[PDB]
C-alpha cells in the first residue's frame, strides 16, 4: 500500500490514467469503472484509493465514510504572489444558460422546457437547479418538470435521458461518463449549443471556455457569447459577463477523496505528482500533462492550476459547507439511492 490506485470513470479517463501510471513509475496505478458511483464503490472495497469528484459526488463519498484530501484550484483574479498550493480556493459559479434567441425564457418559465445537465447528483448540473425547482414548486416530481432532458445517470428509459445521444455509434445513451456526447460541463453546453435543449446547467467558466474561438472543436468553433444569456433567480436575463450577479449558487471546488486511513499518503503522493506533471512542473509538457486532456476534463478540470491544501483536516460536510449540505439532503428526500442506503447500512 505505497502505490496510489486512481479510479478512472470510463475508457477515455482510463487511457490518460494508464499514461499517468507509466510516467509516475507505478507511484500511481489505475482501476476503472463506467460511473463515478461504481468508482466510489471500488474505494470503499479497497480495489482503489482515490479519485477527483464534483462536490455533489463528494456528498455520496462522504456518506460512505470517504474524506476530501486536496481541492482543484483554478486561475484566481488577485493575490498572484502566494503559491497556488497555499492560495485559498474560491469556488465556481453555477449558472443556467439559454440562447438569447429563445424568446421570453426566464427562470419563471422553465416548466415543460428542454434541459441539459452535467449529470445526476453533480452540483451545477443537478443539486443546485433541481434543489431550487423542488423548493419553489413544493413538489418532489422533478422528474416531470422538464418536457425532456439529457441528464446522464438518470433512468435511460425516462424523459430525463430522452435527449442524450450516446457515443459515436449512438450507444450507452445517458451513461454518466465522457463517452456520452452531452456528459459533463462541456457536453451540457454542447447540448444547449446544438439547440437540443432550451437550458443548460453548467458553471460560468464553461460558457467562456467554449465561445469566441476559445475552443478548437467544431460545434464550439464559431460560437459567440452575445448569442447566449444567463437566467437569474429574480427573473431577469443578463449577458454571460454578468455571472457575478446572475448565478444560481457558489459551488465548492471538485476535490480528491480517499479512505481516511489513506488521506496523508494520497496527499503526499499527489503534491509530488503535481511538481512533476502539473501546469508548471519538471515534465509538462516534455513527458506528460496531468491537468490537460486529449478530449476534455479527464480526471481533473483542464482549467486546474494545482491541487491545493485544506484547513485543519475537514469533513466532507465542513468541505462542502453547512448550506450546500442542507440543500443536497433536502433534494435527496425526493429520491432513493441504493449506494447511500448500502453505505448507511455498512458505516452506522
Ligand X SMILES: *[C@@H]1O[C@H](CO)[C@@H](O[C@@H]2O[C@H](CO)[C@@H](O[C@@H]3O[C@H](CO)[C@@H](O[C@H]4O[C@H](CO)[C@@H](O)[C@H](O[C@H]5O[C@H](CO)[C@@H](O)[C@H](O)[C@@H]5O)[C@@H]4O)[C@H](O)[C@@H]3O)[C@H](O)[C@H]2NC(C)=O)[C@H](O)[C@H]1NC(C)=O
Ligand Y SMILES: *[C@@H]1O[C@H](CO)[C@@H](O[C@@H]2O[C@H](CO)[C@@H](O[C@@H]3O[C@H](CO)[C@@H](O[C@H]4O[C@H](CO)[C@@H](O)[C@H](O)[C@@H]4O)[C@H](O)[C@@H]3O)[C@H](O)[C@H]2NC(C)=O)[C@H](O)[C@H]1NC(C)=O
Ligand Z SMILES: *[C@@H]1O[C@H](CO)[C@@H](O[C@@H]2O[C@H](CO)[C@@H](O)[C@H](O)[C@H]2NC(C)=O)[C@H](O)[C@H]1NC(C)=O
Ligand U SMILES: *[C@@H]1O[C@H](CO)[C@@H](O[C@@H]2O[C@H](CO)[C@@H](O[C@@H]3O[C@H](CO)[C@@H](O)[C@H](O)[C@@H]3O)[C@H](O)[C@H]2NC(C)=O)[C@H](O)[C@H]1NC(C)=O
Q: Does 212 bind ligand Z (CB under 6 A)?
A: no
124 is in an annotated binding site: yes
Using the rule CB under 8 A, which residue among 7, 9, 30, 98 binds a second copy?
30
Helix (H) or strand (E) holding 37: helix 36-45
Using the rule CB under 6 A, which residue among 81, 169, 224, 244 binds ligand X?
244
Q: Which stretch binds ligand U (CB under 6 A): 19-27, 150-158, 232-240, 255-263?
A: 19-27
CB 170 within 8 A of CB 85: no
Q: What's the CA angle centered on 223, arms 218 and 227, to 5 degrees?
A: 155
Q: Is 315 helix (H, G, I), strand (E, B) or coil?
A: coil
92 is in an annotated binding site: yes
1 is in an annotated binding site: no
79 binds, among Fe ion, ligand X, ligand Y, none (CB under 5 to 8 A by kind): ligand X
123 binds, among Fe ion, ligand Z, a second copy, none (CB under 5 to 8 A by kind): Fe ion
Q: Does 18 bind a second copy (CB under 8 A)?
A: yes
Using the rule CB under 6 A, which residue among 5, 8, 10, 24 binds ligand Z?
24
C-alpha distances in angstroms, 183 versus 41, 75, 298, 316, 344? 21, 24, 12, 25, 29
* CA–CA separation, 105 and 288 (whole Å): 44
Alpha carbons within 13 angstroms on the beta-carbon side of residue 299 total 29
Residue 206 C-alpha cell reads as 464553461
Distance of CA 279 to the CA centre of its chain: 20
Contacts with 60 (C-beta within 8 Å, 6 or more apart), sequence order:
37, 40, 121, 337, 339, 340, 343
Residue 93 C-alpha cell reads as 459559479
Helix (H) or strand (E) holding 249: strand 249-250
Residues 99-138 that bind ligand Z (CB under 6 A): 135-136, 138
121 binds, among ligand Y, ligand X, ligand Z, none (CB under 5 to 8 A by kind): none
Q: Does 268 bind a second copy (CB under 8 A)?
A: no
User: Interface mask (CB under 6 A) for ligand U, residues 63-82, using x and -?
Assistant: --------------------
Q: Does 27 bind ligand Z (CB under 6 A)?
A: yes
**Residues at the site binding ligand U, with contacts judged by CB under 6 A:** 24-25, 27, 273, 276
Binding-site residues for Fe(3+), in ranges, read 54, 92, 185, 254
Amino acid at each position: 500500500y505505497t502505490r496510489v490506485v486512481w479510479c478512472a470513470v470510463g475508457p477515455e479517463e482510463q487511457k490518460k490514467c494508464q499514461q499517468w501510471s507509466q510516467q509516475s513509475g507505478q507511484n500511481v496505478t489505475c482501476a476503472t469503472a463506467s460511473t463515478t458511483d461504481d468508482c466510489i464503490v471500488l474505494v470503499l472495497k479497497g480495489e482503489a484509493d482515490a479519485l477527483n469528484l464534483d462536490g455533489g459526488y463528494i456528498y455520496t463519498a462522504g456518506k460512505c465514510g470517504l474524506v476530501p484530501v486536496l481541492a482543484e484550484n483554478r486561475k484566481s483574479s488577485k493575490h498572484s504572489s502566494l503559491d497556488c498550493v497555499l492560495r485559498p480556493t474560491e469556488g465556481y459559479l453555477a449558472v443556467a444558460v439559454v440562447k438569447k434567441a429563445n424568446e421570453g425564457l426566464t427562470w419563471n418559465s422553465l416548466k415543460d422546457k428542454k434541459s441539459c445537465h452535467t449529470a445526476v447528483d453533480r452540483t451545477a448540473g443537478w443539486n443546485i437547479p433541481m434543489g431550487l425547482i423542488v423548493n419553489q414548486t413544493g413538489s418532489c416530481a422533478f422528474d416531470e418538470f422538464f418536457s425532456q432532458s439529457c441528464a446522464p445517470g438518470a433512468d435511460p428509459k425516462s424523459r430525463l435521458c430522452a435527449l442524450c445521444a450516446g457515443d459515436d455509434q449512438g450507444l450507452d445513451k445517458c451513461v454518466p461518463n465522457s463517452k456520452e456526447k452531452y456528459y459533463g460541463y462541456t457536453g451540457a453546453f454542447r447540448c444547449l449549443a446544438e439547440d437540443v435543449g432550451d437550458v443548460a446547467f453548467v458553471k460560468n467558466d464553461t460558457v467562456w471556455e467554449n465561445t469566441n474561438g476559445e475552443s478548437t472543436a467544431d460545434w464550439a468553433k464559431n460560437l459567440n457569447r452575445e448569442d447566449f444569456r444567463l437566467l437569474c433567480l429574480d427573473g431577469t436575463r443578463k449577458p454571460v459577463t454578468e455571472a457575478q450577479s446572475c448565478h444560481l449558487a457558489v459551488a465548492p471546488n471538485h476535490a480528491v477523496v480517499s479512505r481516511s486511513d489513506r488521506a496523508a499518503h494520497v496527499k503526499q503522493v499527489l503534491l509530488h505528482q503535481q511538481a512533476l506533471f502539473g501546469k508548471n512542473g519538471k515534465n509538462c509538457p516534455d513527458k506528460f500533462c496531468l491537468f490537460k486532456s486529449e478530449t476534455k476534463n479527464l480526471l481533473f478540470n483542464d482549467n486546474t492550476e494545482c491541487l491545493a491544501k485544506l484547513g485543519g483536516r475537514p469533513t466532507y460536510e465542513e468541505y462542502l459547507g453547512t448550506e450546500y449540505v442542507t440543500a443536497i439532503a433536502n433534494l435527496k428526500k425526493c429520491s432513493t439511492s441504493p449506494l447511500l442506503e448500502a453505505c448507511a447500512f455498512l458505516t452506522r
